[model samples]
Target: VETFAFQAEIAQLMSLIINTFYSNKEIFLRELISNSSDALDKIRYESLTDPSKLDSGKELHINLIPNKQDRTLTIVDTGIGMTKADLINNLGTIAKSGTKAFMEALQAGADISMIGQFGVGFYSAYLVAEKVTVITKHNDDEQYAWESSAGGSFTVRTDTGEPMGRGTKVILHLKEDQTEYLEERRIKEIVKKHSQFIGYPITLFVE
Candidate 1:
């Protein structure tokens, strides 16, 4: 496993977000599902111009699986996945200038979109999850897992589980204080309120 540390600025930004901004914890689900929708849109658009871009037999949809026994909630999407480098760049580092600009804007009293326009919305999962694991398979790259405890570092390595074909699965290990998210009804309510109108289908599975 390769471990990477967040930059000093990013570490501070994450602290600010987890501690101060994003008070509504339920928005985590909205932001995540929205991101999945965007990923689906990307692949669907690509497939429109290049039909072969999509993996055979893969359908576009989002799956929400809540496991009360394991205290975990998983959001899976059959969409365009990320490469190892994409994971490192998108998840590991805050390389986007928009992120810095967003932070500056926030500090300057400028209101912003709840689901980060700068890609930081992914980190919103940290609010309710003690640990987050992203397992993804891009058509061009081998399956890989990127995990973090929202501490200062994260690890990335090859995955040994069944291949995901072409998509991403985000597993959130709920924090003890945030276990309500493991409840099916609660998740359904949040999804209905925030993501019911999303273009793609969102299914909730509880077992």
Candidate 2:
């Protein structure tokens, strides 16, 4: 496993997300679902001009699986997955210039949509999860797993788990205070409220 520390500024930003920025913790689900939709949109758009990209033969959709016994909620999406480089670049460091701009915008009262634009919405998972595991496979790169405790650093490595084809799966280990996310009714309500109109289908599974 390869590990790297988050930039000091980025670490502070993550702390802000976990403690202050989000008034509604449930919004994390919406942000993640929205990201999945964006990934699907990108793949679909690319396939329009490059037929070979459709080689995966996977339909675009999102799956929510709640495992109450394990206190885990897994969100899976059949969409464009990230490469190892992409993972490191996007999740590792917050560009100095970009971080400055994003902080300024937030202080000036930017909209919630900016969270994804600044690539911070993903960290919102830490609001309720003790640990987050992401397994993703890209057409150009082998499958890999990214795991973090939402602390100062994260680790990335080759995924030895079942192949995910061309997509990403996020498994969130719910914190004791955030166990509500492990409930079907609560999850359904959050999805309905925040992502019912999303272009891709969102299915929920419970056990």
Candidate 3:
């Protein structure tokens, strides 16, 4: 297993987001679904240039799995997955320019309605989750899991559980006060209101 500290500016970015972006918490689903759809789009584009890219998961789609017992909401996507290095760089360290620009936007009183544009859409999960785990299988890399509690650091390790075939799974361990996301009706309503037209098909895992 390996561990890493988040980039300094990125940590500040995280704090700013979770502290100030609470007005419309339901959009967390929208941002998350947008991320899954973006991943699907990524694999689709890459597959056109290299046929074997589809070996990860042939059909591109997204699924929402709610676990009442576990107090978790998981978003699974059969899309382009990230490697260890990708996780470290993308999640643990945002480039200086990226964080710099986002801070400028926030300081200017931007509404944060477009969190996706900052590449920090993933952090929106912290609005409702006490912790988040990302399990991903990339075409050229073995499966790995990235887990964090929105703290000073996160850990990465080889995934040793059931194989995911391809793509990524984001599991949000719900906060005590944010259990609303665990409801089926709430999940479906959020999807319909925000992601009704996402290119990829989105579903709720019934089993």
Candidate 4:
């Protein structure tokens, strides 16, 4: 795969986002779930032009599964999946974010914005996860799995299991300090807060 550089401020912004902010930290789950809703909207819009686009009969949904023993939280979504280049560009760099711009537009008019327009929702996983694994299946492409530790690099490979049909599964290997996010109640609260009206369903489970 090819590599490219992100704008300088991208690193500074990332440091600011992952380090100084996320004070509540549970907010990270909200951000991820909201992002899932946004992705579903994108696919649904596309399906309008091409009916075959959505072969996955599942309604758009987000599932949060927590494994206490392993201290891992998995957030899965039945939405659009990323391709290889998308893994590199989408997860690897800070690109143009129309969402961020849209929020800025709202701010100019003194309108309350529900979410930020920054294109960094996926990175929110790093808030609680020491490592992350994304298992995704796309319509035109084969299923793929991407893993990263947020130490500045990630790896991607093809998957050899049952297809997800279509969508993404984001597994967060929680750090010792952020295990509370693994609880069902906490996950549900965050989902409701940032995603209740987000145009999709969000579910959570704890074990």
Point to the candidate with the largest TM-score: 3
Worst 10 residues of 3 by lDDT: 90-99
lDDT of each residue in 33-135, candidate 2, tens digit only? 8878878998899989998887875588999999988999999999888889878775423454455677888889884446666656777787788899988
In the order shown, the candidates' Cα RMSDs to the true structure are 2.1, 2.3, 1.8, 4.3
Model 4 TM-score (2 dp): 0.79
Top lDDT prediction, candidate number: 3
lDDT of each: 0.81, 0.82, 0.83, 0.68
Tens digits of per-residue lDDT for model 3, 150-180 = 6678899999987998888999999888888
User: For model 4, what is the alpha-carbon lDDT of residue 48?
Assistant: 86
Per-model TM-score versus the true fold: 0.91, 0.90, 0.93, 0.79
C-alpha lDDT of candidate 4 relative to the true structure:
0.68
Model 3 accuracy (lDDT, Cα): 0.83
Give me the runs in candidate 2 sitting further than 4 Å from their true place.
21-23, 91-99, 109-114
Model 4 lDDT tens row, 49-136: 9878887744777788899987888888888777766765655334446335534654576221222445565666676788888888
* Total clashing pairs for each candidate: 0, 0, 0, 2
Point out the worst 10-residue segment of candidate 4 by lDDT: 110-119
Which residue pairs of candidate 2 clash?
Answer: none
Q: Write the per-residue lDDT of candidate 1 for residues 125-150, one digit (tens) a residue.
A: 87788888999887788999999886
The best-first sequence of candidates by lDDT reads: 3, 2, 1, 4
